[PDB]
Design a protein around this nucleic acid. Structure first.
Ligand SMILES: [K+]
Ligand SMILES: [K+]
Ligand SMILES: [K+]
Ligand SMILES: [Mg+2]
Ligand SMILES: [Mg+2]
Length: 136
RNA sequence: ACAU
DNA sequence: CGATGT
């Protein structure tokens, strides 16, 4: 603790895993929805969590904001740190779109800088992240 | 085990 | 119960 309330919180939502994936980012303090990605027909939870963080980085950088990002995904936080999404999802025609977005997110990370802290949301202490989809 |  | 990940 404690929660850094001046922050952006992101989360994935899905219908199946693998399944339809979407994500959104919210103001941690107010819950205001700041961005929401159109659903992607097939992806994994972790790909979506990764895309949500990278989109947050891009959203904050464009707005000259130094706020941190919270994610509840140990996996996606590590993938962003490594600039490499180590997903097991088959690459095929059905998964081409999510894999294109993941490839492009990695490419963005490899061509841009940021100081944004990427912080673990401590669900066990604080409850569900503010960007959660309320589906579980 | 832990994080989803 | 199933799945994605370290
Ligand atoms: K949920
Ligand atoms: K969770
Ligand atoms: K497991
Ligand atoms: Mg999550
Ligand atoms: Mg959630």
């Amino acid at each position: 603790e404690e929660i850094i309330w001046e922050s952006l919180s992101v989360d994935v939502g899905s219908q199946g895993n693998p399944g339809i994936v979407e994500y959104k980012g919210v103001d941690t303090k107010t819950g205001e929805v700041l961005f929401e990605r159109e659903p992607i027909p097939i992806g994994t939870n972790n790909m979506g969590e990764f895309l949500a963080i990278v989109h947050g980085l891009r959203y904050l950088k464009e707005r000259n904001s130094r706020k941190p990002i919270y994610s509840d995904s140990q996996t996606a936080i590590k993938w962003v740190k490594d600039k490499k999404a180590k997903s097991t999802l088959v690459r095929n025609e059905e998964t081409a779109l999510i894999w294109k977005l993941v490839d492009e997110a990695e490419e963005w990370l490899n061509t841009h800088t940021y100081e944004t802290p990427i912080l673990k949301w401590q669900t066990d202490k604080w409850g569900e992240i503010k960007a959660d989809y309320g589906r579980k």
